[PDB]
Amino acid sequence: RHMLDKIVIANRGEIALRILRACKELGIKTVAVHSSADRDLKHVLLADETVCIGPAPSVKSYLNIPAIISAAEITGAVAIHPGYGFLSENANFAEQVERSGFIFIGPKAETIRLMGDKVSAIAAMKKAGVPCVPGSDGPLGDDMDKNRAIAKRIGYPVIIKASGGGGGRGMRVVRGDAELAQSISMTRAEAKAAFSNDMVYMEKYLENPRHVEIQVLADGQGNAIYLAERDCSMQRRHQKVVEEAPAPGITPELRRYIGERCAKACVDIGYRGAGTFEFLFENGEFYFIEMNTRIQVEHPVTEMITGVDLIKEQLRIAAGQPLSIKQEEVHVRGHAVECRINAEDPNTFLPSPGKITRFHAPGGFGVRWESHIYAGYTVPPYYDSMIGKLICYGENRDVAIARMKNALQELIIDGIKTNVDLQIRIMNDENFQHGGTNIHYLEKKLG
């Protein structure tokens, strides 16, 4: 079968190393594009070719569209993998890659635009039969009588959300008519300033939901499959801390119900590659909020429970190959837990950059370590706080948690502040040990 000869890894850190490994397993030549502050990245040191695309600030490196495309052209690369974050959900970038004759390892640019606009995305999901949060089902105008009527029909509390927003950014809870006009007005102003798009919509506000998300894969040959779910509720201020697969309390019947709807939605929108349907789960019911049109950070928990290498599937799809597995070949087996490891201060939660003086990774049966860090490595201040991901699998949830506790005790990261101690606390939490804690749990636990 035909495979991509050479690709540009348009990312950094752990995800860039994750992509480099998948490339090497498939015999794909790698081009590591990097900022001047990232010359010592583990994947840069393992890459077949390297191109320094600019200085440390992301604007002149990882978000630098001409420099990334120019690197693909000079090295003779055929495709670009955007990873997560940066330009991965940037439709202009995907269009420019397509326009320049290189393969964008993701969905069509118009699919990114469709799902990136939250109002259009909900309408497409509702039409496809995916359950959505009751809401305005269209943008809000300036007629406050019409806005009060939508709030009445939905039932308070409600949430005002930016169509150009996403991932908890660009939203405001409204509990009564008195706060409605000002809340809409503030959300609009914030959205205009942040996204240069003042469009807002209204949604029913769910008080105690769980964040449950469905993993999908769709090829260019008409196949679209669901790879169970992940529970990503263990979060703080919209930042995921712990993710797990499958989600506790989800039955095979409920898994089948939601998964089939997501797979059908892929067919209807002509989805291609890896994707994630994010839902709020409350009182046995799923409610769509948004679709992630790229690989997710927490993808490894899905890989452990299904045996499917999601990055290798992305590369295969992009090369024009069919999905390597059929739906009937996707089986949920055992349980996996992921602890994100951050170079962060436990009091401020702010990134804690610096030089790692001593480093030791955990090992053992069911223990997977996803990280670019090594002894002597300097965590730069220019980017996000995540330095690694510790993933533990077991035949059941109890075994996965037991292995995580042991793995966190072997993990040594000196010279910088980390959330390792917090991760140990979460694993020891009696409510986490029972499972099914909602999205507000971690914040309530911390204070």
Add this chain to the structure above:
Amino acid sequence: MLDKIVIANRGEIALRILRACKELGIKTVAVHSSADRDLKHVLLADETVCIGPAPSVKSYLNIPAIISAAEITGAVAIHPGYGFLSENANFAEQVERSGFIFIGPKAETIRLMGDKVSAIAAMKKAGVPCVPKYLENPRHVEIQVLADGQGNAIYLAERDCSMQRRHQKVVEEAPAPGITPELRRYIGERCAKACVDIGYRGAGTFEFLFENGEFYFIEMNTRIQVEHPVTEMITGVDLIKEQLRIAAGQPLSIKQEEVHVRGHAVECRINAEDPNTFLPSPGKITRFHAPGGFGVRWESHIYAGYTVPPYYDSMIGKLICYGENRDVAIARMKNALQELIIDGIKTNVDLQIRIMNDENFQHGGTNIHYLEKKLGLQEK
């Protein structure tokens, strides 16, 4: 479960055992020589006891010192690992006479199987095929077993350990290439019946020579196998935790029909020795970096700044890669071997890279003489 156990071993296996104990909530007692105070498992153990000076005869092979440490710490069981006293029937007999649980078979089974004459007679009786014959180009194929010593016994597929130097395994893999589900079931059932017939208790391995679609029994290792992780990857069974459950007097919960072979796993033994002359290379590891990724399993006590002592064997770690198929497991091993950094000492990492890149290994089914023919070494 067993409240507290003495890990009567060292290095990677002692760390392997400690992790299984911690998962089950079993307290650990790390008995160590004065040269092994800095072993990773010793630093992670709940309690530690120095059992003597550096030579194994004075420490790891010192029965009164091990028993005394188990008595003073209030332990109830002893895991002997592999090597050392694991297959010493007098040690197993004394552990039990002292009132402790021996994490292994009965002393009589160790004796029965430890003597080739009585072992072969027990196998002929049990219906296990033996050497009737000249086996010029055989493959080393071995069957993993678990028996509770209560009448239940299961086989957990096979391993191919044909890549050898001076009769020491270098690469191991599971399942064995070319072994059909019919052949697996045939040999496996005879091994499970043999466990019942000899009253076997715990983990064990039946080693065979495999040539022209036929098995020929050589010997039984009456203990956990070094290469046990490749079987664990393909079955999902934690073999050390099963040893611990059996020793606690729990019957096997795993039924034969619950044992499924999925994917493929390869193990590369990592040795502190020269990759060409095989001169042992003890010494301080000045820089260390372990490989990572999907299907990558690293089994080692080594760390940056740790000194590999000159007193013991050269095996410092085991690199185990799994995949949905043999090709994926080999591709993952190549990637993992490139990430593995061990500086300050000589290792066989470069030899392992050559073995993974060998076209006959990539094809599979190379015989027991292959590695030495590739390297130009004379058998002895």
